[PDB]
Amino acid sequence: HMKLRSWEFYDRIARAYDSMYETPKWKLYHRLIGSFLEEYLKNPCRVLDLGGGTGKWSLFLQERGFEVVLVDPSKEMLEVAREKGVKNVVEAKAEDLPFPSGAFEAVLALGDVLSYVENKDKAFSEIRRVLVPDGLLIATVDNFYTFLQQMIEKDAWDQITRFLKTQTTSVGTTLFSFNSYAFKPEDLDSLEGFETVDIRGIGVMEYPDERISEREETIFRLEQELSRDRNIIWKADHIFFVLKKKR
Amino acid sequence: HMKLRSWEFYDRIARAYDSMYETPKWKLYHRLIGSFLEEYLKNPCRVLDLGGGTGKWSLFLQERGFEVVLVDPSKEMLEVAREKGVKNVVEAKAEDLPFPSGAFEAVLALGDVLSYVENKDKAFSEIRRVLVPDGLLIATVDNFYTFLQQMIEKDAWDQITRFLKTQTTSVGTTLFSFNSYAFKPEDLDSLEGFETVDIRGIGVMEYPDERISEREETIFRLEQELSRDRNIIWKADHIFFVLKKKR
Ligand SMILES: Nc1ncnc2c1ncn2[C@@H]1O[C@H](C[Se]CC[C@H](N)C(=O)O)[C@@H](O)[C@H]1O
Numbered sequence: 001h002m003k004l005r006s007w008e009f010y011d012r013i014a015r016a017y018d019s020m021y022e023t024p025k026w027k028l029y030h031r032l033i034g035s036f037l038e039e040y041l042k043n044p045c046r047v048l049d050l051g052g053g054t055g056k057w058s059l060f061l062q063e064r065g066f067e068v069v070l071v072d073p074s075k076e077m078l079e080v081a082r083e084k085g086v087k088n089v090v091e092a093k094a095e096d097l098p099f100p101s102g103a104f105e106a107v108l109a110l111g112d113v114l115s116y117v118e119n120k121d122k123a124f125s126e127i128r129r130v131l132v133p134d135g136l137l138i139a140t141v142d143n144f145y146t147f148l149q150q151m152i153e154k155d156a157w158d159q160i161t162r163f164l165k166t167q168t169t170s171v172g173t174t175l176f177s178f179n180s181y182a183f184k185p186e187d188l189d190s191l192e193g194f195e196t197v198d199i200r201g202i203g204v205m206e207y208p209d210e211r212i213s214e215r216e217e218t219i220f221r222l223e224q225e226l227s228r229d230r231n232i233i234w235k236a237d238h239i240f241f242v243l244k245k246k247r
Numbered sequence: 248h249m250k251l252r253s254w255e256f257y258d259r260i261a262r263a264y265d266s267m268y269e270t271p272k273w274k275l276y277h278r279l280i281g282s283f284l285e286e287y288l289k290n291p292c293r294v295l296d297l298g299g300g301t302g303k304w305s306l307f308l309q310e311r312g313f314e315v316v317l318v319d320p321s322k323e324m325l326e327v328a329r330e331k332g333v334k335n336v337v338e339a340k341a342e343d344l345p346f347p348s349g350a351f352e353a354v355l356a357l358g359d360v361l362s363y364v365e366n367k368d369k370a371f372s373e374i375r376r377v378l379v380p381d382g383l384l385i386a387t388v389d390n391f392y393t394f395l396q397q398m399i400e401k402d403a404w405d406q407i408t409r410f411l412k413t414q415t416t417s418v419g420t421t422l423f424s425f426n427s428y429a430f431k432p433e434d435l436d437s438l439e440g441f442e443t444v445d446i447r448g449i450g451v452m453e454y455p456d457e458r459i460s461e462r463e464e465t466i467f468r469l470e471q472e473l474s475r476d477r478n479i480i481w482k483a484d485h486i487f488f489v490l491k492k493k494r
């Protein structure tokens with residue numbers, strides 16, 4: 001594997017990115033994320049789409065009358081976003097955001113961005129900085145227990161030992177990889193200057209793709225309910241969470 | 248298909264029961280459960296093995312110096328337990344125990360006994376009655392979410408719908424079935440007269456059986472850590488819990 005920085009990996013695949021997440025599972029997950037955004041973002045306001053990639057969620061909010069800026073360190077992702085019609089795009093990393101303090105009511109960090117940033121402390125610090133008091137961070141991240149199950153399936157025993165300590169493993173494709181940090185419950189606990197508002201599981205159950213196609217509405221309603229159950233969310237494929245900047 | 252009382256099913260398969268559960272996975276789960284018993288029963292005391300079957304756990308305790316009585320409504324299971332060297336055996340159901348009150352320090356209801364009892368109110372009440380103040384119930388039960396995931400792979404959606412309401416499904420053989428009630432968190436919340444001391448996941452991850460044999464110590468120790476993690480236990484194959492009779 002060639003070891004890349006995250007944005008260098010995304011520079012290589014930007015133009016195929018959207019086509020990779022058009023499976024029944026990913027359609028389902030997008031529908032869930034979309035329903036959650038409409039739940040937490042009641043009214044139009046100022047939003048930073050951080051690591052916003054090809055602009056999926058920026059467009060979603062633009063078309064609902066929000067004032068949206070997309071930020072991303074991948075020049076190719078940004079170019080794809082611009083072509084798709086995202087109006088405000090900026091090249092930057094989460095670790096060092098070029099926006100003044102208190103500029104946004106909400107920051108999105110969807111598609112596991114905070115699992116990819118190289119310095120989580122600076123990243124959470126910058127997010128808190130750019131939000132108004134009581135602003136929300138709305139994010140999804142990789143789940144430690146899902147990674148661990150996957151590693152056990154792909155028989156990575158020399159690697160599990162390290163991973164249990166670091167929570168960090170490689171991700172990517174057959175030829176190119178970058179590092180991901182998979183979150184545990186204690187990672188979302190007493191974050192400095194944030195109140196945890198909600199945590200939810202995305203993909204609490206695994207469904208065969210065939211059944212998702214056959215029964216999308218039924219399965220979306222089930223996952224809606226299951227995502228709200230605290231006792232089971234760390235079973236999920238990915239983790240969604242919301243923080244509120246303390247006053 | 249034939250529908251049976253739980254103990255009628257066990258009367259049919261009693262002579263094969265020990266042979267059926269001799270697999271790598273179950274060898275692993277038994278090692279987990281044995282280690283938990285040693286943790287919670289640090290001294291020889293008076294134990295009731297309720298639905299103790301062929302006496303696996305009665306014998307485990309007898310050889311460690313405990314005073315154990317095995318109770319089970321299946322005559323054939325009792326006969327197998329006697330032949331294996333279980334000294335004290337009684338034919339009864341959990342819903343109506345012919346023992347005096349306050350007679351045991353602990354009651355074991357292992358191998359999902361409480362998922363099979365027809366009346367959990369009566370069963371829980373009797374258990375409470377035969378325990379001394381601060382006596383323990385130590386038990387394992389089927390996990391609702393594990394059943395649901397299995398059904399999502401295999402069963403008609405209409406069966407899933409019914410199961411979401413009832414938490415009950417048939418178990419057994421292609422030719423013989425009885426009903427199991429799979430537990431949720433809410434079921435272990437505020438049981439009258441008991442304090443929940445601990446809840447643990449048994450078989451939090453899935454392993455290929457081939458790999459369980461190759462890396463048994465490694466897998467045992469990992470599962471031992473994961474079973475103590477409250478955030479992930481509803482992912483587990485089965486649920487282990489400990490209640491204390493309060494005052
Ligand atoms: N340090 C970083 N700061 C901000 N974004 C980053 C950082 N490292 C990687 N990224 C970006 O995170 C994105 C992960 Se892909 C998710 C894209 C979008 N949020 C969606 O959900 O569709 C990539 O576009 C990548 O360039």
Ligand SMILES: Nc1ncnc2c1ncn2[C@@H]1O[C@H](C[Se]CC[C@H](N)C(=O)O)[C@@H](O)[C@H]1O
Nearest residue numbers: 253254257298299300321340341357358364
């Ligand atoms: N109402 C009931 N009360 C007590 N035991 C029951 C009841 N219904 C079924 N059982 C018993 O529950 C047992 C489940 Se099999 C488990 C046996 C033993 N506990 C072990 O772990 O190996 C069977 O022996 C069955 O006969």
